[PDB]
Design an enzyme around this catalytic site. Sequence first.
Site, PDB file in Angstrom:
ATOM      1  N   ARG A 125     -37.924  46.624  19.910  1.00  0.00           N
ATOM      2  CA  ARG A 125     -38.636  47.022  21.098  1.00  0.00           C
ATOM      3  C   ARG A 125     -37.667  47.663  22.043  1.00  0.00           C
ATOM      4  NH1 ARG A 125     -42.151  41.327  21.145  1.00  0.00           N
ATOM      5  NH2 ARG A 125     -43.793  42.167  19.764  1.00  0.00           N
ATOM      6  N   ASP A 144     -52.970  28.658   3.061  1.00  0.00           N
ATOM      7  CA  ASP A 144     -53.479  28.248   4.422  1.00  0.00           C
ATOM      8  C   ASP A 144     -54.204  26.904   4.312  1.00  0.00           C
ATOM      9  OD1 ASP A 144     -55.358  28.586   7.084  1.00  0.00           O
ATOM     10  OD2 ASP A 144     -53.653  30.002   7.187  1.00  0.00           O
ATOM     11  N   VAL A 146     -41.597  31.616  11.579  1.00  0.00           N
ATOM     12  CA  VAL A 146     -42.147  32.561  12.561  1.00  0.00           C
ATOM     13  C   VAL A 146     -43.053  31.925  13.705  1.00  0.00           C
ATOM     14  CG1 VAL A 146     -43.091  34.819  12.785  1.00  0.00           C
ATOM     15  CG2 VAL A 146     -42.238  34.012  10.600  1.00  0.00           C
ATOM     16  N   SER A 147     -43.732  30.823  13.473  1.00  0.00           N
ATOM     17  CA  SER A 147     -44.394  30.084  14.551  1.00  0.00           C
ATOM     18  C   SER A 147     -43.685  29.961  15.915  1.00  0.00           C
ATOM     19  CB  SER A 147     -44.735  28.663  14.108  1.00  0.00           C
ATOM     20  OG  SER A 147     -45.217  28.667  12.768  1.00  0.00           O
ATOM     21  N   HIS A 181     -35.975  33.687  21.820  1.00  0.00           N
ATOM     22  CA  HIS A 181     -37.065  34.673  21.845  1.00  0.00           C
ATOM     23  C   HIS A 181     -38.002  34.300  23.078  1.00  0.00           C
ATOM     24  CE1 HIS A 181     -39.854  37.585  20.353  1.00  0.00           C
ATOM     25  NE2 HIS A 181     -40.723  36.719  19.877  1.00  0.00           N
ATOM     26  N   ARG A 226     -50.391  32.102  21.059  1.00  0.00           N
ATOM     27  CA  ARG A 226     -50.719  32.102  22.444  1.00  0.00           C
ATOM     28  C   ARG A 226     -51.734  33.143  22.823  1.00  0.00           C
ATOM     29  NH1 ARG A 226     -46.244  34.847  26.489  1.00  0.00           N
ATOM     30  NH2 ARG A 226     -45.298  36.361  24.984  1.00  0.00           N
ATOM     31  N   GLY A 245     -49.286  30.010   5.828  1.00  0.00           N
ATOM     32  CA  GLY A 245     -50.031  30.665   6.919  1.00  0.00           C
ATOM     33  C   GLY A 245     -50.550  32.011   6.463  1.00  0.00           C
ATOM     34  N   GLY A 299     -48.839  36.816   8.150  1.00  0.00           N
ATOM     35  CA  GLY A 299     -48.748  36.428   6.803  1.00  0.00           C
ATOM     36  C   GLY A 299     -49.324  37.473   5.892  1.00  0.00           C
TER      37      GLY A 299
END
Lengths: 313, 313, 313, 313, 313
Positions: C150, C32, C117-118, C174, C81, C8, C13
């Site tokens: 955060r 990719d 990570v997706s 998450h 998203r 990716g 990435g």
Amino acid sequence: MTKIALIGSGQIGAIVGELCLLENLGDLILYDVVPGIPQGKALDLKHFSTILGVNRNILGTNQIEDIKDADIIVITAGVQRKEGMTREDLIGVNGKIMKSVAESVKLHCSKAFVICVSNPLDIMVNVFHKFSNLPHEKICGMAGILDTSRYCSLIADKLKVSAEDVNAVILGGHGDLMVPLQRYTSVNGVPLSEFVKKNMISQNEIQEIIQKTRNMGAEIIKLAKASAAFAPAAAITKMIKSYLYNENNLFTCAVYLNGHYNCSNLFVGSTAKINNKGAHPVEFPLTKEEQDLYTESIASVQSNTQKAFDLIK
Amino acid sequence: MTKIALIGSGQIGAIVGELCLLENLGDLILYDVVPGIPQGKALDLKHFSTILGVNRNILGTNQIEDIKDADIIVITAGVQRKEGMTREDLIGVNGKIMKSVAESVKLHCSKAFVICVSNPLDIMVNVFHKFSNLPHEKICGMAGILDTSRYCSLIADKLKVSAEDVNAVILGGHGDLMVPLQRYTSVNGVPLSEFVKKNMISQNEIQEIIQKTRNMGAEIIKLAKASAAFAPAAAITKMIKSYLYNENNLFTCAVYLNGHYNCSNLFVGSTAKINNKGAHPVEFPLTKEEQDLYTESIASVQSNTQKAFDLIK
Amino acid sequence: MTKIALIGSGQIGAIVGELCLLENLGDLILYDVVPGIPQGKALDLKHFSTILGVNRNILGTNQIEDIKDADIIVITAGVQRKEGMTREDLIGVNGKIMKSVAESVKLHCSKAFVICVSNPLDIMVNVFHKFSNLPHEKICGMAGILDTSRYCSLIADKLKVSAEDVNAVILGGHGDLMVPLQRYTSVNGVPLSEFVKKNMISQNEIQEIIQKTRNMGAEIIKLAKASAAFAPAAAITKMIKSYLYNENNLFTCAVYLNGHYNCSNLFVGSTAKINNKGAHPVEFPLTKEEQDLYTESIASVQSNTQKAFDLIK
Amino acid sequence: MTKIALIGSGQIGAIVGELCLLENLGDLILYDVVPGIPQGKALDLKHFSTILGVNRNILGTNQIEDIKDADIIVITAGVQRKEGMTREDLIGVNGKIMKSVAESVKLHCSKAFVICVSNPLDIMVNVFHKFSNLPHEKICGMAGILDTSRYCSLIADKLKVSAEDVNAVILGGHGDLMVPLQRYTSVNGVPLSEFVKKNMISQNEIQEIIQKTRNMGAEIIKLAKASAAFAPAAAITKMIKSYLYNENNLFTCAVYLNGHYNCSNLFVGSTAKINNKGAHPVEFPLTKEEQDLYTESIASVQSNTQKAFDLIK
Amino acid sequence: MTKIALIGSGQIGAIVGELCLLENLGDLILYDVVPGIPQGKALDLKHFSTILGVNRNILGTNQIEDIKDADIIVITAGVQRKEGMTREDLIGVNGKIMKSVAESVKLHCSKAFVICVSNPLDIMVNVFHKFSNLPHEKICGMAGILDTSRYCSLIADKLKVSAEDVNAVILGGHGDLMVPLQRYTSVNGVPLSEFVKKNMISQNEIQEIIQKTRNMGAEIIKLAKASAAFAPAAAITKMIKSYLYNENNLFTCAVYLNGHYNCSNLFVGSTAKINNKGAHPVEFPLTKEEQDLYTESIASVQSNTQKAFDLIK
């Protein structure tokens, strides 16, 4: 996983160990002959590593067998020179120490890349090669990066420019017979000769600089009452980085010549690339006069190297 | 434009200078009473700067007036302790030196943020305050960060975790009366108490670790034959960074207490924040037993401080 | 010699690639599906490398077989998203992509350590495990370091302190069902509860902060019109560093639970250590109420994982 | 205390902000015209800062008055070119946007140092000067450092050497009329001409490399479907650093010429030093042929700059 | 255009010159110290050339400066051993001669590829390297090919097969400590071990063959009253051909070891490839027992080489 062994835990070794920790270059093995010293510095360096968020392993030891499987070996063991002495005055005492270290590297970690730093530098690299039984590309000594830094630093000051991209080539032994090459001096790409044509610096100011470069080692001894430690350590770290990260950077360092610059079968300060596989000389086209000077330096290193071998019996 | 003045060019000072150069924190002024020493170390540091591509200015000097307009002052001037000696044994000789430095800062740069390091640490900060005439927030000493690093380093080793996010509060004088707080020890957020419940470490193992943390300064002196230099320097540089960059980090350091922890009118190791405006104490709710231990530590610092003032006439 | 493969070549990435180059973590392989994209970023990253003096090798490719012998794999392949969508809305399309990547890793480099990570993150780590045929300790996902950043960042702001040594544990998926643990939140060691007692922060302010932590991912989407890229990439880099350098740091990330926290046979956000051998969960003693919240999070991740496997046919 | 204002929060701006944070250069002000975008990127940068232990302040804003008292201004506001477009096609739309930014800088922070990056680069620097009413030394544009990094990167690859100490001078507009100077290209001090004599590279291979350097910006757009972002940001950061730290580094960048290279009253890519006081051109002795090429590049920049002033009414 | 210089015009040299002419390898320079001898052999060789339709140039000379620009140099100068003598008995007299030839090659044709043949072989190669100042890959000695031919010839006879495709590896010094490797012996691809299993040859018959191979040099001296000349010349010619035609053939010859077979900094009989660039060792995986034998041979060559250097002061 990388293991860096520092054979000698003095000023230089410790700072090298410090700089390797700062860039996470590897786990440290701090070795010295003197009991307690490496263990104490290792404690300090752990605490330092804690404050700065570095997590590599650090071991202070008096057992040289702990050097096993080191990927890198930095040799500072030996006596340093005092005021009034030359680097060549250490020939007797340090040749013997270097042979002993060579023998130890031979039996404990024959696959390591070895950076020698004990004085007189070039000579001691030759001693280490003789008794270590390692390939010649896997052995070098740091000196040119340090002399170059001094020369560049002085050039930058006179030109009122950043030293950051002043580069230069200095050939030959780490001593009074260095050969700094004006032709191979540039300021972010612009040759030094352009600055003489623009009257920003003179031939005499350059000769003055070359002289200060030659005597700089002694000058720092005189002023600080100890030999330079920070710059030597940074130079050594630069060579470690070039090996570990396969960078193929072009430095001057004490390296095995083999038909380069009319010289064969000797370690001496020269232009070289350092990568994965070790230190590799590169020959550039010198003028007659430049080569004559370089040969003269190479002759001293030859003589003194013979002297060193003789004195070892 | 930031000027950092190192009053004292020994091991700690130089290394602090080195770390300030690595992060580009500021132009350095290396001061020492001994002629030639700062000049030589300044040379070595320039050459170190050239090799690593740092470009800040570095001035070695014996003229204390060159401290003028320093934003930051690090004081390491003074004698260090040898094997067998306590930090308190230096009280006589260092108090006098600190007073002299205080007087010099008073007339040459009264706006600077002052980090004291000379031993015995807490006592010497109080001497510096008394003769400097600087606001109390603008003066502090480094110690707690060092002692914390040691204690956290040992806790990390016993729990087989990275020291990187092991945090702790150590209150009190930089000496045998330090008060490490278990309650205020965490491993990436998780209190130390969770690791005792999980049987990964015992209350005895912790008391052992607190003892090693107390003696660590002496242990390094015994092993290395010199006092710790790398960790102290990193600790200092952290406090400098907090001030220069207005970070408002929460450390332990020697700071002016003023009704906090039942103590007033004394510099002593305590929880504090460092920002633009200096070092500011912060009071956290101690248990009776914790406060009792802290008060005891404060009492030694009180006594020894009075001693120091007395010996200075 | 270390090979880092980025499966990716989008925002995350490329930044990971950039951060890996800055610390010299390894050679990069930028993969990719879309032709030209990795080649172009690789050119940009080479020029970046040239300016900052980093020398590692960088290969942009559309041939997944170039992922051979990667030591590390970072998987960002998939769709992100948009505004108004949940992470869970990507379940259909990203599950299928993840499977395909699992199958490729399976045949080309079965010895790698794999950071997924997706989104939705925990779910897609379960997918990768199912079709990859790698050991469970060799697979994880990043999330908890992002959510912890955060939450600690907002805590730090409210307390007027540096975020630097605010640490915390967040457990669970998450998503909206994260469980931040107040009890495992410290400010340079000092538990958060001490700051509520000192009235520097209130239980309501903390609930507010926990809500903003939950919604943060969506809030950035709404404001920036793209999903967070810099912080994710940093968190990833931190996990890579803890593996390569055998650090054994204690994080929260998506890890294989196996009787820990009453949960077995599922990758879900939890306390873990990362070292040379992979990601290893660690169980801490939760209260009933904490564990109940954590179990509820684990139930959604269960359901959604089953949903993902079902939708893959 | 240093304030860095990024006018434009696209790819380049954000990455610049990311690099500035990594080196603690200053507090950030992220500005854009589009609401929400800087606020969201500021959030992500805060979280990134929390993970990497950086603590500088970051403010995302749509109110250009927040730019007040910025020490540094980076301008990336403007449209970027797509496939098949030239940089010069953006003249109409970006000239207007540059003028508006100029007018804002004029009333809100007239003491800043201003690095322009909007395309076409040299042209837009001239627009900014015209409407900003700042001193000419306080304004420059980045380009040369990017074009140089490309050219040096390609030279390094063909010679099998580290790019780290390949330096070069590229004169002229950031466009098809760049003038790379072979004479002012060196490899760690050694002129490029030595490598041609040694047959390690040919005159044709060099002309090929010069062509690829010219087209590089377009080639990335073609491959990556977006314009280069990492290398431009790194270049910018290097010029920021040279200003803030008074480094006096010698770059190529768009600078006010004033009798230098037979040119007056125009910003154009040329050899220049950056320090505390801004960007200062330096003239080096060119051959007739070199100067002819440079004057030809200067002519386009002249023409297109006029065109830009004309199209602004 | 190729110039082949034969330093020594005895039996071997002349026959080498004959074989070079048969294959048109080059022009010959026949050198000897004794006046008239080379001129006479050159005449004969010209007449030979005229009968066989070869047209290369042939020059017989006593002036060593006629060796200039030789591409190849074959050194047979020296005294040969008589009945009852070992090759090692010549050490004193030949070492001195070899040094003199080394010096002459050094000044007159430093770019040549040098095949040493004077006995004791391995020892004299090392002498030539020391004084010649040529790269170590450009120097070698022929011996393995001869010993291998003898061993393969005897194996072929016993197996009733053509010697044509019997291949073998023999390691170590040209002397009583040769190490023929049964494992590395084949008959047109089929390992020797297959012939033992088929009962076509026995382990005892093989040991017998090894012994005849070791003594073969002496056995020919005893029978013919002169040392072997035809085979040595053929072997030499095969090594010339491999260099001139860049064939990259894998022979056994005296070659510079450099970390191969646990040996460094010594010329000794080993597996090597010969091509354009010279003689390059290759390491194959030996058993413990094999490597032990080989190391023993390497020890003798070490000792005697030292002896030789000593006897030359």
